[PDB]
Amino acid sequence: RPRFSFSIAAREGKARTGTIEMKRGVIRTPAFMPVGTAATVKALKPETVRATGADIILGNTYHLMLRPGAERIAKLGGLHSFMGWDRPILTDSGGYQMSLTKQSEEGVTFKSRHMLSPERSIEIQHLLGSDIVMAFDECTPYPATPSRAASSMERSMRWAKRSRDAFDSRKEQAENAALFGIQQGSVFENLRQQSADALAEIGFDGYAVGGLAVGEGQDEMFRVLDFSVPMLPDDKPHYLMGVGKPDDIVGAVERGIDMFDCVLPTRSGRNGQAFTWDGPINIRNARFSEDLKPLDSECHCAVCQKWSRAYIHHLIRAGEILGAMLMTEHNIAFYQQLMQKIRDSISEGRFSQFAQDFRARYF
Amino acid sequence: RPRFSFSIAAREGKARTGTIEMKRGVIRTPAFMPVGTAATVKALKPETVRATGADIILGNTYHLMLRPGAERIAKLGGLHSFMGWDRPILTDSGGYQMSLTKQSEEGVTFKSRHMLSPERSIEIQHLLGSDIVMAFDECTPYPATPSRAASSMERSMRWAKRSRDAFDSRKEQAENAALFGIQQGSVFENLRQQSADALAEIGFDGYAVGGLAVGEGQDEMFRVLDFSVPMLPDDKPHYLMGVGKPDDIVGAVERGIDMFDCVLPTRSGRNGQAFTWDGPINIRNARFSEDLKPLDSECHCAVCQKWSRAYIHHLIRAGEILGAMLMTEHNIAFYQQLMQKIRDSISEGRFSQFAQDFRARYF
Ligand SMILES: Nc1nc2cc3nc(N)[nH]c3cc2c(=O)[nH]1
Ligand SMILES: Nc1nc2cc3nc(N)[nH]c3cc2c(=O)[nH]1
Ligand SMILES: [Zn+2]
Ligand SMILES: [Zn+2]
């Protein structure tokens, strides 16, 4: 394979399906990336993550720089060999993870003390051996005034240029990894346009829509996507950071998004929430204590082939680790089945019907 | 297969190796039973427990009667289908699990309020669909005076008779399951003899040595085994309840024990302790933070094939579920490799050399 090649095999409206080819493997798009923040997708072996259909997972510069350390992981052979995942890994840059500081034009120092900057973020992502490196940005808080959103976006665009130059100055990274830029501008069309233009002038391998999934709510998120995604280069992947619930994913693909991540299937699975095609259920509810059906009636995952709602109910109520394992495997497999149904429906020219059907039943 | 058949294929001294055949499968002896107290071997799918080599797992009447309930499990199709383990299951009777009350000759009531008795224990084990049912006994506290140990043992022997009659009165249970008696008598030879005699007069499919692994320490435990195991019928399995550390298992097999259980590999694995042929290690120790070796240098388990000490160190320090999963799978696989080396060495007439070699290196 090449360092990076995105090809679009079929289209319907603004939706696209295709493939990203990288040295460590092929990513089918639209893609959902399970989140592996501490060098693990919580409660799953990497072979189980792959068996659900994932082609790529997400890691985080911020978390891994703190524990176990980026230089440590490099000394141990990089993130892929450390955790036993040999396929592509995308790493976020630390520009969100303000969520968990002294800010300046140079970067951010935060509470031991640590520092991140465009140069240091890109370096950490190199030490980890990331395949898709995210530019170092500022996720603008929501809501933001137009002035604050503009200042923040402008700084992020200067940081995007510094990110590009830091990545390109490291020959091994430039030859083997890809770099994505992150659009900012909050909910304001003109600032989203200025940001898209800045990013396309610099030039990246892919373009993320940043600054969403920060409390704005679906209607607003969709309105911003309606004008923001068309601003990005059409021939590169479009990544919506941190999204989301199954309905959010379907509507975002209808608006031109190719890549997704979120902790909802893993985190809410450990808390008892199971996704089904008839909507989410909370397995802790006493109504499931003698329910012999699988979590979902159609799901092909190994959990639904083997165990009942009643058993998983018991495990979660008892605080047993196997309950977290089973709930997480099912929810990640559900998300991957959703992405496969989206890909196949776009490929067959029937995605808009799929999206309507999905919603009618899920709600 | 038959309901129950124990065959001894080879002997060395007091040690034996062979097989127990039951309707749900064959158990290779000497056997280690992973503990699955809440209807799960903690942090392992049943297929992973089987892949480590286990032939049988242990469940507990006390815990399962409280959560999810014995009648509930029966309504759901029994413990095997509930948890997805289709091989034999031994259940303890609740006579230990005083550890976690109003006692009388009729049984014990304990804190909601619950009751156990010989009749109710055997009934619960039937509702669960246990393959090896334990008689309802009193595990005598340690230390005990000879008078208190005698009173307690005598009550247990009356309860053993009631257990036998309750099991035999239930045709489906009598035809499909096995019943083991439990010897008591604390550390006193004459009371152990009286108990063995009582149990052999009643007649059981197997005989447990109860009342040990309750704080007495290895030397004392071994002294009691030295005289107690020969008192039991030679042609039936001998089960030492709750034992134990790898060295305890080796010395108990040298004294005629065929079956073992304990929470040490699962519980101490979640707490960071890994078994190796050079003795246990605590993976949380900072000396492992950049150690690329597997947990154990010779272990054939999937954990040792794929992940380093450094990674597992990270996971346990971070409180990640995958650390508990990996540590537990390795420790259970280590225990099963120990039992396989014991079986093969007895079969080859070189168990005493194995035991000496094991100890020289483990210590
Ligand atoms: N670097 C970066 N990461 C992000 C991660 C996110 N997760 C959610 N929910 N929203 C996010 C936005 C950003 C963002 O704007 N920048
Ligand atoms: N029913 C029964 N169960 C037991 C379980 C045990 N676990 C350890 N550590 N010792 C034990 C003794 C008994 C015992 O004497 N009776
Ligand atoms: Zn499923
Ligand atoms: Zn191992």
Short mmCIF file of N, CA, C and O in Angstrom, two decimals, chain B residues 46-113:
data_model
loop_
_atom_site.label_atom_id
_atom_site.label_comp_id
_atom_site.label_asym_id
_atom_site.label_seq_id
_atom_site.Cartn_x
_atom_site.Cartn_y
_atom_site.Cartn_z
N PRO B 46 -16.27 -18.00 29.07
CA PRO B 46 -16.11 -19.44 29.26
C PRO B 46 -15.23 -20.08 28.20
O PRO B 46 -14.49 -21.02 28.52
N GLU B 47 -15.27 -19.60 26.97
CA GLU B 47 -14.40 -20.19 25.94
C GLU B 47 -12.95 -19.95 26.28
O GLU B 47 -12.04 -20.77 25.98
N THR B 48 -12.60 -18.85 26.94
CA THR B 48 -11.24 -18.57 27.36
C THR B 48 -10.86 -19.45 28.52
O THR B 48 -9.77 -20.01 28.56
N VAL B 49 -11.75 -19.67 29.47
CA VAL B 49 -11.50 -20.64 30.54
C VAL B 49 -11.20 -22.00 29.93
O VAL B 49 -10.25 -22.69 30.33
N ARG B 50 -11.98 -22.45 28.94
CA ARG B 50 -11.72 -23.76 28.36
C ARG B 50 -10.40 -23.72 27.63
O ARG B 50 -9.65 -24.74 27.70
N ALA B 51 -10.06 -22.67 26.91
CA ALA B 51 -8.80 -22.65 26.15
C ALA B 51 -7.58 -22.74 27.04
O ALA B 51 -6.52 -23.19 26.59
N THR B 52 -7.68 -22.36 28.29
CA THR B 52 -6.55 -22.53 29.21
C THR B 52 -6.36 -23.98 29.63
O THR B 52 -5.30 -24.25 30.21
N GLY B 53 -7.33 -24.82 29.38
CA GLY B 53 -7.25 -26.23 29.72
C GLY B 53 -8.19 -26.72 30.81
O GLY B 53 -8.19 -27.89 31.17
N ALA B 54 -9.01 -25.82 31.37
CA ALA B 54 -9.92 -26.28 32.44
C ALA B 54 -10.96 -27.22 31.89
O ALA B 54 -11.52 -27.02 30.81
N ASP B 55 -11.26 -28.26 32.67
CA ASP B 55 -12.25 -29.26 32.36
C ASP B 55 -13.54 -29.12 33.15
O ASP B 55 -14.55 -29.71 32.80
N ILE B 56 -13.48 -28.34 34.23
CA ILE B 56 -14.56 -28.19 35.20
C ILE B 56 -14.33 -26.88 35.93
O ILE B 56 -13.17 -26.48 36.14
N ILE B 57 -15.39 -26.19 36.30
CA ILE B 57 -15.33 -24.97 37.09
C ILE B 57 -16.17 -25.15 38.36
O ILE B 57 -17.01 -26.04 38.42
N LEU B 58 -15.94 -24.28 39.34
CA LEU B 58 -16.64 -24.30 40.60
C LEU B 58 -17.65 -23.17 40.67
O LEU B 58 -17.29 -22.00 40.41
N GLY B 59 -18.84 -23.42 41.13
CA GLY B 59 -19.83 -22.47 41.51
C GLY B 59 -20.19 -22.62 42.99
O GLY B 59 -19.76 -23.52 43.65
N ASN B 60 -21.01 -21.69 43.49
CA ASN B 60 -21.29 -21.62 44.93
C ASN B 60 -22.80 -21.47 45.16
O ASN B 60 -23.41 -20.49 44.71
N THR B 61 -23.38 -22.37 45.89
CA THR B 61 -24.77 -22.33 46.32
C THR B 61 -25.10 -21.04 47.03
O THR B 61 -26.15 -20.42 46.75
N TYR B 62 -24.24 -20.62 47.95
CA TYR B 62 -24.55 -19.42 48.74
C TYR B 62 -24.69 -18.21 47.86
O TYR B 62 -25.69 -17.43 47.92
N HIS B 63 -23.72 -17.89 47.03
CA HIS B 63 -23.75 -16.70 46.25
C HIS B 63 -24.90 -16.69 45.25
O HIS B 63 -25.59 -15.71 45.10
N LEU B 64 -25.10 -17.83 44.56
CA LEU B 64 -26.09 -17.86 43.52
C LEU B 64 -27.51 -17.87 44.06
O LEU B 64 -28.43 -17.39 43.40
N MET B 65 -27.70 -18.41 45.26
CA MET B 65 -29.02 -18.33 45.88
C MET B 65 -29.35 -16.88 46.18
O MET B 65 -30.55 -16.52 46.15
N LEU B 66 -28.41 -16.04 46.47
CA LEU B 66 -28.65 -14.64 46.78
C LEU B 66 -28.82 -13.84 45.50
O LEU B 66 -29.69 -12.97 45.41
N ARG B 67 -27.99 -14.11 44.48
CA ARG B 67 -28.00 -13.33 43.26
C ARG B 67 -27.47 -14.22 42.13
O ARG B 67 -26.29 -14.61 42.30
N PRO B 68 -28.23 -14.53 41.12
CA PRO B 68 -29.56 -14.07 40.77
C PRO B 68 -30.72 -14.82 41.38
O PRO B 68 -31.88 -14.42 41.17
N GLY B 69 -30.45 -15.86 42.16
CA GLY B 69 -31.52 -16.73 42.70
C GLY B 69 -31.51 -18.07 42.02
O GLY B 69 -31.33 -18.22 40.80
N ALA B 70 -31.69 -19.14 42.80
CA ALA B 70 -31.66 -20.49 42.28
C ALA B 70 -32.87 -20.83 41.44
O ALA B 70 -32.74 -21.38 40.36
N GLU B 71 -34.04 -20.51 41.91
CA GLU B 71 -35.25 -20.71 41.12
C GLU B 71 -35.20 -19.91 39.81
O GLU B 71 -35.64 -20.48 38.80
N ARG B 72 -34.66 -18.72 39.84
CA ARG B 72 -34.51 -17.91 38.63
C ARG B 72 -33.62 -18.63 37.63
O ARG B 72 -33.90 -18.79 36.45
N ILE B 73 -32.44 -19.08 38.10
CA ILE B 73 -31.57 -19.79 37.18
C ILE B 73 -32.24 -21.02 36.61
O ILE B 73 -32.09 -21.32 35.42
N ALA B 74 -32.98 -21.78 37.42
CA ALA B 74 -33.68 -22.94 36.87
C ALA B 74 -34.67 -22.53 35.79
O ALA B 74 -34.77 -23.22 34.77
N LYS B 75 -35.41 -21.46 36.05
CA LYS B 75 -36.41 -21.02 35.06
C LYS B 75 -35.73 -20.64 33.78
O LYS B 75 -36.32 -20.78 32.69
N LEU B 76 -34.51 -20.12 33.83
CA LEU B 76 -33.74 -19.72 32.66
C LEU B 76 -33.02 -20.87 31.99
O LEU B 76 -32.37 -20.65 30.96
N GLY B 77 -33.10 -22.09 32.52
CA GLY B 77 -32.54 -23.27 31.88
C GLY B 77 -31.35 -23.85 32.57
O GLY B 77 -30.78 -24.77 32.02
N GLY B 78 -30.99 -23.34 33.73
CA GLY B 78 -29.91 -23.90 34.54
C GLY B 78 -28.64 -23.10 34.35
O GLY B 78 -28.48 -22.31 33.41
N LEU B 79 -27.69 -23.36 35.25
CA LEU B 79 -26.44 -22.58 35.27
C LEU B 79 -25.62 -22.74 34.04
O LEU B 79 -24.99 -21.76 33.55
N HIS B 80 -25.56 -23.92 33.43
CA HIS B 80 -24.70 -24.14 32.28
C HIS B 80 -25.14 -23.27 31.11
O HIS B 80 -24.33 -22.58 30.49
N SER B 81 -26.45 -23.28 30.81
CA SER B 81 -26.91 -22.43 29.69
C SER B 81 -26.89 -20.95 30.06
O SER B 81 -26.54 -20.14 29.22
N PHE B 82 -27.19 -20.59 31.28
CA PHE B 82 -27.15 -19.21 31.74
C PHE B 82 -25.79 -18.60 31.45
O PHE B 82 -25.67 -17.52 30.86
N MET B 83 -24.70 -19.25 31.90
CA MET B 83 -23.37 -18.66 31.78
C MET B 83 -22.62 -19.10 30.56
O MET B 83 -21.55 -18.50 30.26
N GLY B 84 -23.11 -20.06 29.82
CA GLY B 84 -22.44 -20.51 28.61
C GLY B 84 -21.27 -21.44 28.80
O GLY B 84 -20.33 -21.42 28.01
N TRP B 85 -21.30 -22.24 29.87
CA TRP B 85 -20.27 -23.24 30.13
C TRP B 85 -20.98 -24.58 30.05
O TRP B 85 -21.88 -24.86 30.90
N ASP B 86 -20.68 -25.44 29.10
CA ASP B 86 -21.41 -26.67 28.90
C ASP B 86 -20.74 -27.94 29.45
O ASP B 86 -21.29 -29.04 29.27
N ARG B 87 -19.62 -27.77 30.13
CA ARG B 87 -18.86 -28.85 30.73
C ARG B 87 -19.24 -29.00 32.20
O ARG B 87 -20.11 -28.28 32.71
N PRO B 88 -18.68 -29.96 32.92
CA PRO B 88 -19.06 -30.12 34.31
C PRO B 88 -18.81 -28.86 35.15
O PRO B 88 -17.90 -28.09 34.96
N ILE B 89 -19.68 -28.73 36.13
CA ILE B 89 -19.66 -27.73 37.19
C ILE B 89 -19.80 -28.42 38.53
O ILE B 89 -20.73 -29.22 38.71
N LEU B 90 -18.89 -28.17 39.44
CA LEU B 90 -19.03 -28.55 40.85
C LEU B 90 -19.57 -27.36 41.63
O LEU B 90 -19.07 -26.25 41.44
N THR B 91 -20.57 -27.59 42.48
CA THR B 91 -20.99 -26.49 43.35
C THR B 91 -20.71 -26.78 44.81
O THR B 91 -21.07 -27.83 45.33
N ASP B 92 -20.10 -25.82 45.49
CA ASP B 92 -20.02 -25.91 46.92
C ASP B 92 -21.42 -25.69 47.48
O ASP B 92 -22.32 -25.15 46.86
N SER B 93 -21.64 -26.20 48.67
CA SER B 93 -22.94 -26.36 49.34
C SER B 93 -23.40 -25.19 50.18
O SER B 93 -24.58 -25.15 50.54
N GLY B 94 -22.55 -24.22 50.43
CA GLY B 94 -22.83 -23.10 51.31
C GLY B 94 -22.21 -23.35 52.70
O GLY B 94 -22.18 -22.42 53.50
N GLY B 95 -21.61 -24.49 53.03
CA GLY B 95 -21.06 -24.77 54.35
C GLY B 95 -19.84 -23.98 54.76
O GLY B 95 -19.40 -23.91 55.92
N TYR B 96 -19.18 -23.31 53.84
CA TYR B 96 -18.09 -22.40 54.12
C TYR B 96 -18.61 -20.96 54.15
O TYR B 96 -18.23 -20.19 55.04
N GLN B 97 -19.36 -20.63 53.13
CA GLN B 97 -19.61 -19.31 52.60
C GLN B 97 -20.71 -18.55 53.37
O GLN B 97 -20.32 -17.38 53.68
N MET B 98 -20.96 -18.74 56.57
CA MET B 98 -20.21 -18.37 57.79
C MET B 98 -19.06 -17.43 57.47
O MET B 98 -18.73 -16.49 58.21
N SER B 99 -18.36 -17.59 56.35
CA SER B 99 -17.29 -16.65 56.00
C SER B 99 -17.85 -15.26 55.72
O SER B 99 -17.28 -14.22 56.05
N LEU B 100 -19.02 -15.20 55.09
CA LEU B 100 -19.62 -14.00 54.56
C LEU B 100 -20.89 -13.55 55.28
O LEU B 100 -21.27 -12.40 54.97
N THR B 101 -25.88 -14.85 61.23
CA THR B 101 -26.29 -16.25 61.21
C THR B 101 -26.86 -16.71 62.56
O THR B 101 -26.40 -16.31 63.62
N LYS B 102 -27.85 -17.58 62.45
CA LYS B 102 -28.42 -18.42 63.49
C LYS B 102 -28.22 -19.89 63.08
O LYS B 102 -28.82 -20.26 62.06
N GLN B 103 -27.40 -20.63 63.79
CA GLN B 103 -27.22 -22.03 63.46
C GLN B 103 -28.07 -22.95 64.34
O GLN B 103 -28.20 -22.68 65.54
N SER B 104 -28.60 -24.04 63.82
CA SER B 104 -29.28 -25.07 64.61
C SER B 104 -29.05 -26.43 63.95
O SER B 104 -28.43 -26.51 62.85
N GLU B 105 -29.52 -27.51 64.56
CA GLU B 105 -29.42 -28.82 63.96
C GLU B 105 -30.13 -28.88 62.61
O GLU B 105 -29.84 -29.73 61.76
N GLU B 106 -31.13 -28.02 62.41
CA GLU B 106 -31.89 -28.04 61.18
C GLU B 106 -31.14 -27.39 60.03
O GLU B 106 -31.32 -27.86 58.85
N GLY B 107 -30.31 -26.42 60.25
CA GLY B 107 -29.59 -25.66 59.24
C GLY B 107 -29.15 -24.31 59.73
O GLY B 107 -28.96 -24.10 60.92
N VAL B 108 -28.96 -23.35 58.84
CA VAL B 108 -28.45 -22.04 59.21
C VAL B 108 -29.32 -20.96 58.56
O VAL B 108 -29.57 -21.08 57.36
N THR B 109 -29.74 -19.94 59.30
CA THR B 109 -30.41 -18.77 58.74
C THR B 109 -29.43 -17.59 58.85
O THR B 109 -28.66 -17.47 59.78
N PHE B 110 -29.44 -16.78 57.81
CA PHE B 110 -28.44 -15.72 57.77
C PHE B 110 -28.99 -14.48 57.05
O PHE B 110 -30.04 -14.58 56.38
N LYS B 111 -28.25 -13.44 57.36
CA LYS B 111 -28.41 -12.11 56.78
C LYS B 111 -27.63 -11.98 55.46
O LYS B 111 -26.40 -12.17 55.53
N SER B 112 -31.77 -9.02 53.59
CA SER B 112 -32.84 -10.02 53.61
C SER B 112 -32.39 -11.29 54.34
O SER B 112 -31.23 -11.63 54.57
N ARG B 113 -33.40 -12.07 54.71
CA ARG B 113 -33.06 -13.26 55.48
C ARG B 113 -33.10 -14.46 54.56
O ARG B 113 -33.91 -14.57 53.65
#
